[model samples]
Target: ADVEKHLELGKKLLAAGQLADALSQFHAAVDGDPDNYIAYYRRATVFLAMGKSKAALPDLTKVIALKMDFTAARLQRGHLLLKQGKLDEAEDDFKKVLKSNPSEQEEKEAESQLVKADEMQRLRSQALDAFDGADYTAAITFLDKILEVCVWDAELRELRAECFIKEGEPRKAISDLKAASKLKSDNTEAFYKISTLYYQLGDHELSLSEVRECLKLDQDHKRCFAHYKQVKKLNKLIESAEELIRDGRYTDATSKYESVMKTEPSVAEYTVRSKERICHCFSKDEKPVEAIRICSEVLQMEPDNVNALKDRAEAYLIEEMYDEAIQDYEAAQEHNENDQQIREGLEKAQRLLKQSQKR
Candidate 1:
């Protein structure tokens, strides 16, 4: 009788938004009747509303024990366990929630949430196993599936970013890094990677921004500090190589640019930039064969690289390889009709080819 009276008064106070008074009444109910499950349930909700997850635990457990059919309470416990780092317990509670049918409709989507939890668990495990086996493609497949459900999951996004790195898709990796950085600003891993990815992308400006972020996060961090020094030195080498180009030191310029170009896992924009530079220097210095080799390799990596195609054509024309020159010159012209060099090269190669074919 006394327990019912207090629970009635507690419900009235809770409805009135008098949470503190309601909590006091619920405690009185619990004090008068130690096994009063309703008091614990009502008080635990107030605890949850107050963000006292620890305070809610004993009361939540008691509610579940006394009423196993309470599906909402079970779901709440699973949510609590997940936040508490109790994965196994949380998984079991979610499974139990799915097995129960709510007495009302419009809550049908609750089953979907339950199943997504199960799928996330299974998919996360599969992704980790695939990553450990070095099957980066398969790891990416599982990670993509997991991300569909756990879209804001920082750890999963980071792992997917790692898979992208191994597959040599640095730009794709940056997408995941951005997501991870937004989700967990303090991870430091994300900031370090944003710097590295932007460095690879040839946007040293953005790379420098993330570098500053990394330093601010951890000033004494060895890796970020090393990368900072690396970027500074790399840009210096770039300036020095371009300076060699201006000095008309073709041989020395190509050598310096080639050295800088060897830093791979970088990106297409810079690699193509340096390769085209090397080809220009070599072709102009009367080394047609050397220029052909560099340009041909660059074209293999980027078939649509019109600058490389033009360089290779010019090199071929100098070597009297008119047929090959004509082919490459025409290809370059197709990509850029306004290129004067390509038009002249094409006309020269065709005239030479016609004279040779007449023989």
Candidate 2:
């Protein structure tokens, strides 16, 4: 068949990784004889190599229809269907190939592909189980193991990163997503995951960076606009907080600090800073009662807050409550036994209390 000649040349070019040239030659061969099974089969192979399974499927179907004895076509079609995630179709193709010719090499390859499909299914099931149970760490571990074997699987890596985020390890998720982006540069899911993890970690700059990369790679990314909005909002909040603090409006600064706390309540620094500001505001207003109340709130939140204890002691002294001052100073000393400030404050309060008792 003259079509076979062009198909053979196409095969050579494909083997050399000249995909465009191979595809062109296959097209020419198929055009020369539309009913040529070999041309159709070779063209399908090229389409599969290019990751165009949808384009390849019809040609592969044609190859099988034209030449029912084409066992190689059935095997290749099975693999393509597997790549397209048409497991039932893939299984049927493989079974047909096995029935036609039980060659050892063919049988082994078919069985191996079957096992691969089964393994992927099992891994997916395990991942779903872990996810459903809210065991995100275990889900990430399970997905990561599968990704090790299927290194080019962008979807699996993205799923693993999502699990990492759910497990409260955004940094680990970003690392995996970055690797996945490199594997499939056009995969918007990987880029989106990277952006989300960066944002979760409070690295807005890095988050915006990833968002831009994602948009550059694919303009129509589903989460791009939403993520960009979130990053902008977070950046605005940070800027507003900084501006309030710079203006020395300590009371208003507490409000801004509380905003941050609302989003990330576990951030000890924000809680501590808010408490400190409230104490300072009361002291500046000459309201010893309010200062003592704020200090008590701080102690409730952080029992070892030395600054809060110190502030409370000062408030007690201002109110002429020497015994209360002594108690706060002693508590601060207990929290930090090596602090000279606390020890001296305790001593001073105790002396004042003793003098007043004598009066």
Candidate 3:
């Protein structure tokens, strides 16, 4: 009924940890006495206790309006404004309190807050400068400090993500981008970055899912739409190639993998893998000459490619080139000494060479 009754009940509710009830009681107190600066200040504290600093802001403003000398309310609002990046407004509040007759403790608090604001602004500029200068590690260090107090600042998160990318830590970049995406709903760029990173990491399915998320946010997102198609086609081709291999259709699988080779040259992983698969397919299909040729291409690209060595060795054996087979098998075994196939092939080639020499 009375403002004091409401304020007293609200404090009791707050003490009991009934935060919602406390908030409602404070609301009732404010409603009963519109000009009660005490009621507004108490309500602002309740909102802060609930971790709704933004909700507390207007109430703190109201408190300061009703009583210009409310140093405590000014301090509270100043802190909230600083957290919100309203440096000018927050500094004005802190300055006004300092000039007016704040207690020593309040004066120290306001001065420290001002110093923090200055340091935060300085760090922001340094971080950007370091990033632009290509000193990604320094940028990340600065970003880490800024993020300690500005955790919800999506732009800062995105900047940190970019620094991580420049530092060649795609996984860390993806982590920051994911956080930024959550903070900003229309973050198609974040989803696009995640998709591209996952694709480069060889997680095609996950890459596709992230690109789909990007497309969901903006269907006409050019890069995402194009990447979605590229990944989709590559995935389908790879899947079909695996099915064909399982069905013993090596020639058909070879054709499918050849198609994969023509997809994107900049992404060399797929090209190298498809070439290896084509070599295997040729070997399985009894086209030893073609197998040897394709395997040679892979060996030239990767001198120590064990699979290419093994396939080429097998192709040599098929062509009755026991000497070449033995050499290749020996090289393959040098790379993987415990491989049963290499050991068996080497043994067979030795035996065949010995038999032919006897003849």
Candidate 4:
């Protein structure tokens, strides 16, 4: 009778938002009836209502201990364990609930949770296998699926970042590394990767800043320190090249760009930019054949490079190769319809061709 009175009052107090009084009543009920599973379950519910999940855990465990067939308590505890990443324990609890002939609704829920765990496990293996095979696109597809469910997974984010890097999409990788860096505070490697990617994309200042971020995280980071010095020197070399170009020292500017290209041979953008600048310098120095050769190489790498087309067209015109000049100018004009230089060059080449034909 006393236990009933405490439980009855506790339910009413809990409904009235009187959590402390409700807890006191439930405590009395549990003290009065130590083996009463309902008393422990009700106290667990009250703890949940008060937003004390940790405190509720023990009561829920006691409820299951007292009555092993308590499906609801098992489900709740299994759910908490799953969220805490204790997948094996959660699976055990869920399997027991399934075999204990729970309510139809609870059986379905256990099946669903088990399927979710299976999917996560399967996707992890598929992603790793694809990454190992160097099939980056396939790996990325699998990673994206898993990440949708586990957004805070730092290791997965790093793996996806690597896939993006392999696919030559550094811009996409940068955002992933940024999240990884935030999720794992001491991820100096993420910062270093972002720095190198920025350098590859030809943003010297941003690359230096990112490398500095890595160095600030760990002063003894050897790679970051070496990258910092290298980027600084490369920036100086680029600055010198630009200054030489402005001073009309085409020959000297060509040498500077060539040195920069050799310094960073693996970066595609650096190679392309250096080759384009060298082609322009050759055209400016009236070395038509050299300009044509270098610009042709750039065009092979980047077919629609408007600057290379224009430079190569000028070189052809200097060599009196009217047919080649006309073809290149027309191609350049097609890419940039508003370029006055291209329009004028095309008209000049056509007119010269017509006059030569008349002769």
Off by over 4 Å in 4: 1-115, 129-138, 167-171, 200-205, 266-269, 287-289, 338-341, 348-359
Question: All models: lDDT?
Answer: 0.80, 0.77, 0.88, 0.88
Error of 3 at 99 (Å): 4.6
How much is the lDDT of residue 97 in candidate 3? 91
- Span of ten consecutive residues with least summed lDDT in model 1: 103-112
- The 10-residue segment of model 2 with minimum total lDDT is 263-272
Residue 176 in model 1: lDDT: 86
Which candidate has the top score in TM-score?
3
Q: Count of backbone clashes for each model? A: 0, 0, 0, 0
TM values, all candidates:
0.57, 0.54, 0.73, 0.64
Q: Which regions of candidate 1 deviate over 4 angstroms?
A: 1-112, 133-136, 197-212, 243-252, 258-275, 284-305, 312-327, 334-341, 344-359
The digit string of per-residue lDDT tens for model 1 on 1-359 reads 88899999999988898889989999999999988677889999888877777788888889989988777777777777654435577778877776777644414544555565677678778899999999999989998877765555678788889999989898888888987887665857788887898897787667877887889989998999999887766676677888998988988888787777675335667767788889888877878989999888888887888878877887887898988888887787886989897788788788887887894
User: Residue 243 in candidate 4 has what lDDT?
Assistant: 95
Q: Model 1, residue 147: what's the lDDT? A: 74
Q: Would you list the clashing residue pairs of candidate 1? A: none
- Candidate 2 lands at a TM-score of 0.54
In candidate 4, what are the lDDT values of residues 160-218, reduced to their tens digit? 99999999888999999998877666878999999999998999879988998898999
